Amino acid sequence: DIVLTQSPATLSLSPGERATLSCRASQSVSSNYLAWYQQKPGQAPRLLIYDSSSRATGVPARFSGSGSGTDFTLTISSLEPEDFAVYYCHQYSDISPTFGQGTKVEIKRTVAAPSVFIFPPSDEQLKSGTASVVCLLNNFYPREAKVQWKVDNALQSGNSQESVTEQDSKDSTYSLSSTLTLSKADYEKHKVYACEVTHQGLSSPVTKSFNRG
C-alpha cells in the first residue's frame, strides 16, 4: 500500500504569509502521479495541483506543487483569506489510490485564554436517570486545550466527549464544550464536580467547580 503522511497536522499562519505543506509517501509514487486538493467545511474537494506540479485550470499562481519520489510539498506563496482550509494529498500511481490525512491551514491569532464555565445537570434530567455535566471553554486561541474532569478529585476517563466550533469569523477564536455523562447514582454518590483546563493562555491550570447540592 502507499501510505501518505501529511505534515504538519495544522499550520497556523496569518494572511500574507507563506504556507509550506508536506506530503511524504511510504514508497515512491510512480510517474509523480500525485495531486493536491483544498477542502472547505461542507464543501466538495477542489483540485489544485496534479502530476506533482501541474496547476489545475483557474487555480491561482500562488499555489505551486513540487517534489518527487516520496517527498512532496505544496506551497501557497502568500495566504489569501479564502485560502484557510484543509488540504489533502492523493497518489493515483497504483491500483489502490490513497490520500494523506490532511493539513488544516488556520488563521494565526494572539493567544487568548478561554473563559471557563461549568454547568451541573438539571434536576429535570436527573429524574430520568442520567447526569450530564457541561464545561464550556469560550473564545480561546490556539485550539489546543486539555480539559480534565475530576469527580471528588478522581480523574475521569472514557465518559466525556468534546465538541469544538470552527474558527470564529470575527475574532478567530475557538470555543469548546466538554460533556461528562454519569449515572444518576454515580452523580448523587459524589459531591465535587470540577472542570480542569490547561491552555497556552493560562500560566496555571484553571479549575471551575460546583458541589452537588
Binding site: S96, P97, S115, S122, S128, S132
Partner: protein, 214 residues
C-alpha cells in the same frame, strides 16, 4: 462541467443502497469515474473505480465483495450499489471524474450522505444550562438524545445572537446525537432578562422552547 449525486440517506446495518451520479459538461463515455467518501470528521478515502475504455472495476479493500461500481453511458450516469452496509460506511459520497495524468480528480459532485444506523427516529430532550453565581455569565441548552441529525436552535426567537455558540453535534455511545447551545451574558441581566432556546428537530417533528432559568 458538473456531477450531481443522488440516493444517499438512512439505511440500517446489513441494508442496501444504490447511489447514482449524473454527469454533464464533458464526454462521459471518454472518462474513468470514481467514488470517494468522507466519514464524519474524517479525511478522504477512495472507494471504487471504473474504466471507460473497457471497464475494469477496482475497489477499496474494506468494500471488496460488498459494493459494485457500474456506469450507464447512455444515461450519463455512474452507479454505486452498496450491499451489506456497515456503520463505518457512514459517509459523504462523492462521485468524481478521474483524469489521471491529465488531471487526477479534476471534477467533483456535491456529495451525497449515506448514514448507516440501527437507530430509530427520536426527538431530543432539552435541558437548561443554568447560570449561577467578572460581570459576565454563561447559560444555554443541552439538546440531548435525538436521531437523526439535524436539530436547529435559536435564542429568544432569533433576537439574542451575540455570544451564542451552538456546537456541532456529537454521536453518543448510544448511537443518539447530542449538542449544546450556550450564550454568554451580562451577569446583571439574570432574573431581569428572560432567555429561551427554541429547538427544532424536523425528522421527528419536535419543537421545544425552554426557558433557561438562573
Amino acid at each position: 462541467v458538473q456531477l450531481v449525486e443522488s440516493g444517499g440517506g438512512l439505511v440500517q446495518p446489513g441494508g442496501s443502497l444504490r447511489l447514482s451520479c449524473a454527469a454533464s459538461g464533458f464526454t462521459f463515455r471518454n472518462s474513468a469515474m470514481h467514488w470517494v467518501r468522507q466519514a464524519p470528521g474524517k479525511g478522504l478515502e477512495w472507494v471504487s473505480s471504473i474504466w471507460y475504455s473497457g471497464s475494469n472495476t477496482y475497489y477499496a479493500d474494506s468494500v471488496k465483495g460488498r459494493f459494485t461500481i457500474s456506469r450507464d453511458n447512455s444515461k450519463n450516469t455512474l452507479y454505486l450499489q452498496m450491499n451489506s452496509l456497515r456503520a463505518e460506511d457512514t459517509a459523504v459520497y462523492y462521485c468524481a471524474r478521474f483524469a489521471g495524468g491529465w488531471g487526477a480528480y479534476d471534477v467533483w459532485g456535491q456529495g451525497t450522505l449515506v448514514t448507516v444506523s440501527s437507530a430509530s427516529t427520536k426527538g431530543p430532550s432539552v435541558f437548561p444550562l443554568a447560570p449561577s453565581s467578572g460581570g459576565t455569565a454563561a447559560l444555554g441548552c443541552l439538546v440531548k438524545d435525538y436521531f437523526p441529525e439535524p436539530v436547529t436552535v435559536s435564542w429568544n426567537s432569533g433576537a439574542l445572537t451575540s455570544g451564542v455558540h451552538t456546537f456541532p453535534a456529537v454521536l453518543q455511545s448510544s448511537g443518539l446525537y447530542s449538542l449544546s447551545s450556550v450564550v454568554t451574558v451580562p451577569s446583571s441581566s439574570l432574573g431581569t432578562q428572560t432567555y429561551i432556546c427554541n429547538v427544532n428537530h424536523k425528522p421527528s417533528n419536535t419543537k421545544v422552547d425552554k426557558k433557561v432559568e438562573p
